């Protein structure tokens, strides 16, 4: 009883929770993303970016964190305008300009964020008068060298994604770019879900290579608990989040490293960690990194 497993596990627990978080938010099948964002956001050139086929919580959360981190590197004034509760059913100009202070920075970046991730409400809910006021604000910032705008639209919706696209193309000189989220095959999806629960911290530890061998093993064994759970992720809506939530629970619930391995081998099932237990908010975002 001289050596306490509880002390070692606390360190592992916290490291596993951090990596699971990181893995979830990394859109590994889209490696081009981080380079794309630094190019377009960390410049004084105005830009409109459409994020099409944003079908998963992990994609939205992942893109958002990546955007949030890229703008954190920008040392000039960054203004954030959330367009959502404005366009749905010169006050805009004056609100944007109130935030523009030439005493704290000569150059400024206005980041307009619009999120339309409910394909159900496909009909144009947006006020045409509020939309033309927005493209007018953009037409003014476009002509102002001192101020750069970064418009980021998140959709899977089309009757909205198209009306914006045509209005922005017709009235502005700034060419927009479309970042298409790739549609994975069931096999590919299965690959990236497995990758999410593989940890790389403390590479030179027998305990980490024991953890990673167990998961690789269980997943090659068709009848193992872990592999049956993964066979369900093939049909359940939102598998990365369901897996994330369940794994977070089995990590946090365990007392020793052995308890954690026991849960992966014998306790992780649809009957024990059910879909119902969690809220799959399509616009959910995880807490920021410390450093």
């Amino acid at each position: 009883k001289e050596r306490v497993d509880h002390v070692f596990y606390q360190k592992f627990k916290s490291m596993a929770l951090q990596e699971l978080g990181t893995n979830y938010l990394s859109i590994s099948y889209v490696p081009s993303l981080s380079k794309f964002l630094s190019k377009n956001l960390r410049s004084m050139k105005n830009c409109i970016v459409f994020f099409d086929k944003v079908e998963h919580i992990h994609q939205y959360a992942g893109i958002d964190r990546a955007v949030s981190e890229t703008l954190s590197l920008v040392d000039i004034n960054v203004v954030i305008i959330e367009m959502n509760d404005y366009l749905m059913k010169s006050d805009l100009m004056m609100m944007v300009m109130r935030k523009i202070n030439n005493d704290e920075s000569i150059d400024h970046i206005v980041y307009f964020k619009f999120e339309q991730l409910d394909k159900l409400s496909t009909s144009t809910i947006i006020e045409p008068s509020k939309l033309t006021e927005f493209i007018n604000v953009l037409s003014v910032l476009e002509k102002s060298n001192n101020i750069a705008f970064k418009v980021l639209i998140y959709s899977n919706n089309v009757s909205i994604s198209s009306l914006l696209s045509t209005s922005l193309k017709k009235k502005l000189n700034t060419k927009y770019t479309v970042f298409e989220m790739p549609i994975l095959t069931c096999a590919q999806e299965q690959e990236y879900l497995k990758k999410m629960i593989k940890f790389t911290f403390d590479s030179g530890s027998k305990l980490l290579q024991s953890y990673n061998s167990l998961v690789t093993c269980q997943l090659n064994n068709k009848e193992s608990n872990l592999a049956i759970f993964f066979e369900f992720l093939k049909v359940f809506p939102h598998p990365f989040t369901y897996l994330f939530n369940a794994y977070t629970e089995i990590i946090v619930q365990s007392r020793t490293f052995d308890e954690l391995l026991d849960k992966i081998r014998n306790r992780l099932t649809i009957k024990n960690y059910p879909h119902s237990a969690y809220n799959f908010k399509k616009n959910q975002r995880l807490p920021l990194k410390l450093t």
Binding site: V252, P287, L288, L290
Partner: protein
């Protein structure tokens, strides 16, 4: 003046509380909660949400925002608010003491009304009532009375 012997309950350093705390079980908290870096990071977000411009009716909104932003299960946020008599000021005090002392709910904390505290308030026993008022004060006493003749 600006001194209170109640400061010791708010004065808890979140850096001395290992994250996630042993008392922070999955039946009270959501998977998002376990993804804060420190007890300080959670505390700071809690303060951010709590300091919103809510109207006294919007108790349903706050419970939802605590669930979405800090990962506190809706049923647990409601339970906490009830034993706090609605006083949002004593919300961070609850979590600091709950985590430090590893007890849910914190038993002897001014502003945190236990079940046994309500049993003492229900009884007209002036000995139990002296012990209660020495814990929460006449302020919280008249608030708890107002709160339950309206319940």
């Amino acid at each position: 003046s600006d001194f209170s012997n109640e400061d010791i309950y708010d004065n808890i350093d979140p850096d001395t509380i290992s994250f996630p705390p042993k008392i922070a079980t999955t039946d009270l908290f959501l998977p998002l909660f376990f993804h804060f870096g420190s007890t300080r990071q959670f505390m700071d977000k809690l303060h951010e949400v709590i300091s919103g411009d809510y109207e006294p009716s919007q108790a349903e909104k706050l419970v939802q925002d605590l669930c979405d932003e800090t990962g506190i299960r809706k049923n647990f946020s409601t339970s906490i608010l009830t034993c706090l008599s609605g006083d949002l000021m004593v919300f961070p005090r609850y979590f600091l003491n709950m985590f430090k002392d590893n007890v849910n709910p914190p038993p002897n904390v001014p502003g945190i009304w236990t079940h046994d505290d309500d049993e003492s308030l229900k009884s007209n026993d002036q000995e139990q009532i002296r012990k209660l008022v020495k814990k929460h004060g006449t302020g919280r006493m008249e608030m708890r009375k107002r709160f339950f003749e309206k319940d």
